[PDB]
Amino acid sequence: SGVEGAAFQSRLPHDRMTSQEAACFPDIISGPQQTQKVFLFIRNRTLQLWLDNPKIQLTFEATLQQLEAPYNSDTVLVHRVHSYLERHGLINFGIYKAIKPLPTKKTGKVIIIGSGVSGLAAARQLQSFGMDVTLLEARDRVGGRVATFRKGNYVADLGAMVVTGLGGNPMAVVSKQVNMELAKIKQKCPLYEANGQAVPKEKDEMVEQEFNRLLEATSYLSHQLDFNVLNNKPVSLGQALEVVIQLQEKHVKDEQIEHWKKIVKTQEELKELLNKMVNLKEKIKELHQQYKEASEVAPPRDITAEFLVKSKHRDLTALCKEYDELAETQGKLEEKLQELEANPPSDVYLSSRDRQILDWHFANLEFANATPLSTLSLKHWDQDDDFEFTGSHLTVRNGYSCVPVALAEGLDIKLNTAVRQVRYTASGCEVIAVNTRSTSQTFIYKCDAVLCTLPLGVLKQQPPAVQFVPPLPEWKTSAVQRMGFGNLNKVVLCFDRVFWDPSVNLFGHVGSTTASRGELFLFWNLYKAPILLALVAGEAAGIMENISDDVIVGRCLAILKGIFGSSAVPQPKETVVSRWRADPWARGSYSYVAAGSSGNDYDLMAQPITPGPSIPGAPQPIPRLFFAGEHTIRNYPATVHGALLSGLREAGRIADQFLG
Amino acid sequence: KPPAGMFLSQEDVEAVSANATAATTVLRQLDMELVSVKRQIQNIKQTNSALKEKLDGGIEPYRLPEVIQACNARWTTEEQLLAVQAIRKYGRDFQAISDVIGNKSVVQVKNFFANYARRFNIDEVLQEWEA
Ligand SMILES: Cc1cc2nc3c(=O)[nH]c(=O)nc-3n(C[C@H](O)[C@H](O)[C@H](O)COP(=O)(O)OP(=O)(O)OC[C@H]3O[C@@H](n4cnc5c(N)ncnc54)[C@H](O)[C@@H]3O)c2cc1C
Ligand SMILES: Cc1ccc(-c2ncc(OC[C@@H]3CCNC3)cc2-c2ccc(C#N)cc2)cc1
């Protein structure tokens, strides 16, 4: 339960071996199951020992110490497992205290492009492995897309502000090492329409399921019905959502038609009944006149006249009883007419307003995936859901910048230094860079390996900002073009004081139009100070970046005034506005599996580039250009924990190569 | 296995997707169908209203009071004559010939017209009823 829990935190199955363990321990997986169990226990126990105190290094000696028999036998086995878990970053990763002071005898040289979480993690690991590492950053700061505004006692994350659960999250360990305060968030997102009036509980809950149900319906339309290509072209989540909505409206309509058709059927059957009853009535009238003309022949009569009277009597009674039967049926049909007239099917699927609120929900989905739903693949947009961490999603109250900065201690970061060209050959690598302040100052860094952590938005740039010599192969460039890089933005609003409900962490705004469903759609409180963050998502983001600061802040204050009152919003003290797609060093926000791509493209973008032979007929060169980043991890994309996992992985790979 | 509250079938998807405007066309055609049905509902409602206006007054006024008669078994000469005539007119609705006689039952009528066969040439009377 404890060792197994260690397997769980480390994203490893506790009861079987992984492919990397089968590759580094091919002898154990290929032999007796008992020895496999032994290996698995040594793994899980070393991992538990590390995770129970991540602020100190775990040495092979301590591991064997703290092991018992029969698992303290095969000292080579234990040493092998420790080495594996250390090289791949499952133990002794992050900011820990070194028990074995490193060596000044450093082997190999690597240039890491980028000082984000990916690059910083890779650099720390490669330095601990004994290599010389120099990071080249264009910005004047570390962290990259982990950015924290800090003015006075105002602190607010402009990039990453969240940990998507701590159950199996690497960041958990880091949080114990950096002392970063994590705070929960409260479900409650009271929605408020344009008028400023809240949405009634009963329509809010309606619409919220209709949203969940429509998403499940897109999933069903993809996985059972195979509606993943249309017009020779791949389908998106938005196209499927609109197809589903259209079919629901069709259903309303058709049910409708069937109800009115039952009504017509019953009506016209009443028609025939009544019509027969009119005829029968005139006939009874005539027969009654005849009975009266016959029964006024005086009582002294032959038997033919008596027969006339009595036969007309019988015929009259028969026809009258038939009329009474038709008249009972008249009522048993009018009754069903007014039953059906009184249980009408539904008129609409979704009212205009209902639909605006559905648009708010769609905008939340667009915000978390940082892209218009028209850009996401219906079949592979949720391919990362099977690997979600367990627990409650949390926020960073002190500034999540705390992580990158702490990871940059003792590393050789060259800030304000922007790479222009990466040259890789069978003898080494040459990174050309410039000074962001004086472009004319050129720098040449020669290396045994390069680790590119450049954002996908930078790698997508055409005209290119970084040139690769020799040019990067097509199997990589097409993946770069296929994969999606999104955009989301924030508006940090600092204030005199709290004018909102301190008990609610999220409160929303429903937009007037579907096209404006992302325009300042959510306001968020998560700090000690009087700060509110206004979130911009979807197609709105890319447009809102071409609107002045003051105009955005004014729209924000306007909706806040409509919500809480013009007398309760003070004018903001400090205001910040994000523009991530315009950032020349980001070119957007985070990746999204786009229509036409898959998770195999992440893996392709994580594959190392191996140069060609300089001399013809020379032994195959070794790989030289390695890649890491959030756009390189399939099972955990577009996240900080994904970037750190990528950095650790690439550090392990590079060391496996150049250190053995 | 689609979701609950969602109605999605192969065919309908293909219909709404086959063309760039197929969706709006289908929906708005059904729209039109609905108007058509309700135009005809109002038509027939006015028709039936007129017919019911006709039937105002019911049949109460040419009804004849009901009378009960204890079913005897002695055929009076008058009753026999009435029965012959009621055969000639009603053929073999003997319930009805009991109704016209009023003092006979359906089995007594059925008997009668073996009882008297030869004597009232009832075969010939029936033949005549059938032309
Ligand atoms: C608004 C927003 C909020 C997010 N919030 C979260 C969150 O709460 N949690 C989460 O898990 N994920 C979040 N994500 C995604 C997550 O922040 C990122 O995946 C991740 O932090 C970036 O990883 P990285 O180090 O590979 O990229 P980067 O941090 O961008 O690393 C690349 C570095 O290279 C530098 N660089 C660029 N061009 C050059 C050049 N030519 N020469 C030299 N250096 C260069 C950049 O300045 C940057 O520092 C968010 C993303 C967005 C857009
Ligand atoms: C209240 C709340 C809680 C969680 C999420 C969420 N939930 C899931 C998620 O997933 C990452 C995606 C998965 C697919 N690739 C990247 C990301 C996010 C996320 C978190 C913070 C910001 C900011 N500032 C932006 C997005 C949003 C709001």
Side-chain angles (χ1 to χ4, degrees), chain A residues 159 161-162 367-369 384 393 488 490 506 524 590-591 637-639:
Chain A
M161 56 159 76
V162 176
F367 180 79
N369 292 105
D384 66 281
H393 292 193
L488 74 88
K490 297 180 229 199
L506 305 167
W524 199 334
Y590 50 70
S591 64
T639 60

Side-chain angles (χ1 to χ4, degrees), chain B residues 90-108:
Chain B
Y90 290 94
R92 297 173 175 112
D93 189 333
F94 308 78
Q95 206 304 354
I97 295 149
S98 158
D99 297 337
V100 298
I101 298 178
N103 199 271
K104 301 288 190 276
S105 71
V106 182
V107 60
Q108 316 158 290

Side-chain angles (χ1 to χ4, degrees), chain A residues 113-119 136-139 141-146 158-164 400 417-420 453-455 458 465-466 488-490 580 584-586 588-590 628-631 638-641 643 646:
Chain A
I113 304 170
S115 48
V117 175
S118 63
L136 301 183
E137 176 59 46
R139 302 165 185 285
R141 63 184 177 70
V142 301
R145 282 175 271 174
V146 164
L158 310 168
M161 56 159 76
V162 176
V163 183
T164 62
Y400 195 40
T417 302
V419 170
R420 292 272 157 82
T453 77
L454 291 172
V458 171
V466 180
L488 74 88
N489 272 302
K490 297 180 229 199
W580 277 108
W585 315 121
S589 85
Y590 50 70
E630 64 90 5
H631 61 286
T639 60
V640 171
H641 56 262
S646 82

